[PDB]
Symmetry: D4
């Protein structure tokens, strides 16, 4: 892609509901060229899709957690655990990291009970889990993963 | 909102580019009622917007980090630091948490150098920062923050 | 319950040996209405009972400890351990928490020996216990769990 | 005190609303001797008072925390901090301990917001506070501080 | 024992090679009373013996270590480990403590090799040992365990 | 010194109250040669003195602690702190070590109060002290610093 | 060896491609004596060999790591693990240390993927490995192991 | 560079004292082409120089340390500290890393005293140093930084 695609993406990452006109007029190129470039970006998998950004509060997702998981070493344990963690309802982020913890898990729940029943109890029963340490998020100062071009 | 809104959102959180027909036909309600409900959800701020989901790899965002920041206690330090962290280019997530660290920062960069220059050096110069500990993400097993209804 | 019940409870949490007169006269309501409301609160389980507040020193409970317990992950280990900990003589508090430790145990003993024999040795033999870390309380600056309305 | 006082206290620590008859009949001594012994125990400060045991849930005290506080060393910092911590609304327990933390603070709040505003923000502004680490209690397996004789 | 015994012990803890005369003359009591009191203290096990204080340097005991040992929980593991640690040549101190470590071991060796072969390798093979962490002493600012009366 | 001195010291480190005869007869050398060698060892400072081994329990030294101290870096802080620690009554051991702590302090007191007043409060007021962490010794499995030849 | 050998080595550790003349003329000794001394040093194993110092960047060795490994205690585990770690491609340094970690491993790789596949995955499958913690080197301020005489 | 340069370097990294003949004959290319390629590699800075590999033991470098340094945050502290650390005699490695420590320092000394005087005391006086933690190397299982092509 070129500098022009970047300008297009920088817009779509913020607002995907702009008309081709508004975007074409802003970036200064013909609407048909824009439409082509956008379809192009999707074909090449640069743009994997379009989503509605839903306010978590609106769904009463008040119990936000960031859990560090240490896996029992050996075998294929790490790959297996990673996947078992990604399948848990409420978990939207699973990262394998370098440090004192193996995985960092991002999850959201409506309440403490939901969290205990849907996430904690489950994880504590997963075989390859050595230990977990959950940090409760008391305030989201920022959460805009959609902004990839800064 | 009602059970019907939930079904609508569960779709839009995955694919916001469905036609009113496809959605109306799936949920079994008239297209005009759907259109109204969607506009309604936006007005009430349930749906805050629509974004293009851009593949980070496509932008060579290879250096992914999860940094824990400890703030120097006192004054208005915490609120100030939180905000200074959210303004750093590449940082898309800033969380105030309960535990041994004050903030958890999610950031992405193309390379180690970009990371050092844009993020690390900056943060180490921020007054209210007592200490930082960065965990490098070697593998993203899952990152779908858009899925709020599970 | 209403604001009036709150005023009643705020008194009973401090001194349950006040006469109906003294309380009725303070809150400005008829003694029979008070008596009814109190019986009401007990029926609904708001007031679970009345206890004598006994000075621990008077019983030579000089060895006060706050022990963090880490459980071995898996199975039904956590629920089982929690219960085995609550049954140990001298233990009055058992909490399951989010952090690097699973349970926080509050206990009191007359001496170091009593502590070793009644608590430590027992806990170290409990199967589901991975590790324990005891913090000895050298000074109780405050311990008024009875004050729930502040 | 003697073995008889112990039997009396063991009862009062559980239920202070027993009639002199019921207690006198159980322990097998004359009601007047019992009444005297009880008044005696109060005079000597063994029994410091009687409280109503109020269910915290009934007051929506859902946010339970156990916070470790590290004080900045020097001066009279420790004594001062201990006291400033004991005065915070919602805090019912403050302990000075031997270990990696100076104080362990037990507090209860209705919600996360109340906790942030009444406790966290306050503590982070206290001068003699070096650091704090809060463990959120997700389950109270046991909390019977009233039971001193086991 | 009385204040007089204390004065006697305070002397013997520093220098056990004083004549009865010198001590008797200092404390102002008859030599025969002193001799009796000393024999008395030994009989009652107050004075368990007399030792020559040997300079460790003179024996080339240059490798001084303070090792923290964590035991595997369960069974009779703790008592067993404690004893196995006390039997290792070079180890003069073994303490069971409250904290994140179970035992603190004081040992001395002529060199790193002696330490590795006599202590480290041995301990790492002891079954009930979960982990060890050795802190090398680079400077003895003070080591006068003989001074019990200060 | 030679192998013979070693045999002599190995005896004196255990029992310094043996007669020259008993020792001379055991090691198989003339009493006058022994007496000379012993005086020799003292002159050369191999034997720095003779002490009475006093049972700490006999003096009610029940509160045994092992405290790790972290010093504030810079200046001549370390040397100064080391010395201030060695002067505290009850402290018999002070070690500068390699690890996460700067000094390891061995102390003994009759009670918790004595410990708080004589040691803790003092140390917390020492300027060059950054932090302290005290591990309470609940059991002395072994404490024979006098045994240097094993 | 003597002071002269030291001067020779101090040169060879920096530049082994100096002519015998240049070195002989600098240190002020006959070329034949120098040649002899150098051959001598090699025979005695003081000089174990000569290497070309290759710039790691030139080989795209961009992923530099320092990994701490904790071994499972018991048996011959430590010796075995040490050796298994030294055989891993990319690993140039393996150290057994005193502290909270057993081994410190120095390794270099071209990328994160190479690191994951060649080092991490391998190590996590090694039986005697209890845990690993990798610190990513973002900047080499200095790496001159060749300088032994300073 | 090409595959041929790699083969050349793979040899020179192990033994730089091979004749052009031996190398030319092994890799199967003309001696003049080899000589050219080698000079080429040096010009381009691939080969930065040739060193004698000196056995550290031969120089009595028995005290090997790996020290983690935490810097005081702010200003230009990190860059300054890094450089001050690299200038200390005996220090051959200084790395800025991601984790709980800022720098990892590799150093070697003949004895504990040399280490204390040349390294420790110096570092503890460096202003920008917050804390240091030294791990003593008791065994070098492997140290071949010269092997860059594996
Ligand atoms: N320029 C526009 O925005 C639309 C018309 C233009 N000719 C096109 O490419 O479609
Ligand atoms: N998950 C972890 O904490 C392990 C990562 C760590 N960097 C390692 O050596 O593997
Ligand atoms: N049913 C549909 O999907 C569209 C027609 C319908 N009458 C409406 O509400 O618009
Ligand atoms: N940011 C932190 O780690 C602080 C949170 C911690 N729970 C506290 O007591 O404040
Ligand atoms: N007012 C009182 O305190 C007692 C009398 C009142 N009429 C009642 O309700 O019993
Ligand atoms: N008991 C614990 O420390 C575990 C709680 C931790 N928050 C977790 O992830 O489970
Ligand atoms: N025995 C009782 O319980 C009451 C009567 C008894 N004579 C008394 O001491 O009052
Ligand atoms: N509050 C603390 O953690 C300090 C207690 C610790 N035992 C000390 O040495 O002071
Ligand atoms: N006073 C002394 O020191 C020795 C003589 C004294 N009459 C005694 O008790 O032996
Ligand atoms: N040895 C230890 O560290 C354990 C002691 C710790 N105080 C406990 O709870 O057992
Ligand atoms: N042999 C002994 O024990 C004493 C007598 C011997 N002739 C001496 O050297 O004194
Ligand atoms: N006292 C300490 O813990 C410091 C020792 C540590 N080995 C260092 O680097 O200084
Ligand atoms: N002096 C030199 O550098 C070479 C000549 C000298 N006579 C030798 O020993 O070879
Ligand atoms: N590898 C380690 O961390 C162990 C070393 C530690 N000094 C010990 O006691 O063994
Ligand atoms: N082939 C060799 O090794 C040397 C001779 C060859 N003709 C050259 O290039 O010098
Ligand atoms: N030196 C350190 O430990 C800091 C590195 C850490 N990864 C950070 O956030 O800066
Ligand atoms: Mg999106
Ligand atoms: Mg009560
Ligand atoms: Mg002695
Ligand atoms: Mg070399």
């Amino acid at each position: 892609m070129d500098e022009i695609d970047l300008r297009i993406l920088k817009i779509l990452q913020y607002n995907a509901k702009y008309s081709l006109d508004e975007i074409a007029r802003e970036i200064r190129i013909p609407k048909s060229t824009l439409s082509y470039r956008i379809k192009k970006l999707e074909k090449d998998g640069v743009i994997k899709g379009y989503y509605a950004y839903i306010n978590p509060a609106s769904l009463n997702l008040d119990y936000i957690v960031i859990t560090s998981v240490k896996a029992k070493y050996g075998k294929n344990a790490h790959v297996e655990l990673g996947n078992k963690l990604a399948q848990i309802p409420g978990v939207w982020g699973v990262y394998f990291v370098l440090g004192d913890n193996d995985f960092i898990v991002m999850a959201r729940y409506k309440t403490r009970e939901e969290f205990m029943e849907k996430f904690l109890e489950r994880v504590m029963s997963i075989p390859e889990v050595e230990r977990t340490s959950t940090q409760v998020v008391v305030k989201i100062i920022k959460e805009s993963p959609n902004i990839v071009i800064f």
